[PDB]
Amino acid sequence: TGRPEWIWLALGTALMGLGTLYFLVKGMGVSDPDAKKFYAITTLVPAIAFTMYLSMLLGYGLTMVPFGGEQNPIYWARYADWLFTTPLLLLDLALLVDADQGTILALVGADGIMIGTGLVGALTKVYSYRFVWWAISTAAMLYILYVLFFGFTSKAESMRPEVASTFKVLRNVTVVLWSAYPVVWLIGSEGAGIVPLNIETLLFMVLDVSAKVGFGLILLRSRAIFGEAE
Ligand SMILES: CCCCCCCC/C=C\CCCCCCCC(=O)OC[C@H](O)CO
């Protein structure tokens, strides 16, 4: 409670934990193999986020990085979370549209580059270089978003209508929410430092819960997750 952002870390921990438990209960008894994949991916996402939020709350997921002549508090645990949860979210989208394996690898690999370069930027001691890493990570994000909109055209003709509808919604949620992350980083403690760490933490908490629990609620309520069966 000594760090003013503790309240948002505590709320994030609680919301990710509750979301995990809800998805776990909802997925009980699901037998359809396709739906099992979606439940597994979508429950793992907030479970991982729960552990990383808790690590930030307890202080383990925080380090001090010297730059700008100050000791800057950097929550590195965010990147450990996103390293696993962001490819999983992309996998949900890719499986919906029956994406080719090559497209899945492109997405997951670009996503790993996005998170890894974000982490390097977050830990870099030379202030100006932090924004070089931010730019590379943002380029990887833009590549991901491009694929989401322009890499699935060969699947549109044979796509079930409910699949197309649910994918379209989830893709729009993804573009809007994922785009905000580089902005928050750029203006917050890890970038220009014009927004204080406590407000940055609040912003990431709202984004994370929306991108994980909100996204999951939309997906797991849809008929698109079930194979076409009589
Ligand atoms: C001047 C620096 C230039 C280098 C900047 C690199 C840094 C990372 C930037 C963007 C991510 C690149 C993602 C690479 C993954 C592309 C995979 C691919 O090409 O997939 C095509 C295939 O047909 C399947 O759809």
Q: Is 136 in the pocket of ligand 1 (CB under 6 A)?
A: yes
CA distance 117 to 138: 9
CA distance 160 to 162: 6
Pick the atom of ligand 1 nearest to 147's CA: 25
Residue with tokens 């690590």: 55
User: With contact defined as beta carbons under 8 Å apart, do 119 and 98 qualify?
Assistant: no
CA distance 178 to 142: 10
For ligand 1, mutation pick of 86, 143, 150, 152 (most atoms within 8 Å of CB): 143
Resolution (A): 1.0
**Method of determination used here:** X-ray
Distance 35 CA to ligand 1 centre (A): 31
Q: Is 116 in the pocket of ligand 1 (CB under 6 A)?
A: no
Question: Is the CATH number 1.20.1070.10 carried by domain 3-224?
Answer: yes
Cβ count near 11 (within 10 Å): 17
Q: In Å, how far are 92, 99, 152 from 161, measured between CA atoms? A: 17, 16, 15
Question: Which tokens belong to 77?
Answer: 């645990």
Residues 6+ apart with CB under 8 A from 59: none
CA distance 22 to 185: 30
User: With contact defined as beta carbons under 8 Å apart, do 79 and 120 qualify?
Assistant: no
CB burial of 113-133 (b: ≥16 within 10 Å; e: otherwise) equals: bbbbbbbbbbbbeeeeebbeb
How open is the CA angle 185-175-192, to the nearest 5 degrees?
15
Distance of CA 66 to the CA centre of its chain: 27
CB burial of 190-224 (b: ≥16 within 10 Å; e: otherwise) equals: bbebebebebbbbbbbbbbbebbbbbbeebbebeb
User: With contact defined as beta carbons under 8 Å apart, do 195 and 4 qualify?
Assistant: no
Distance 2 CA to ligand 1 centre (A): 43
Which residue has the CA at smallest separation from atom 3 of ligand 1? 136
Helix (H) or strand (E) holding 72: strand 70-75
Q: Is 99 in the pocket of ligand 1 (CB under 6 A)?
A: no
Amino acid at 170: L
Q: Is 133 in the pocket of ligand 1 (CB under 6 A)?
A: no
HSE on the CB side for 5, CA within 13 Å? 26
Q: Is 139 in the pocket of ligand 1 (CB under 6 A)?
A: yes
Strand partners, 71: 66
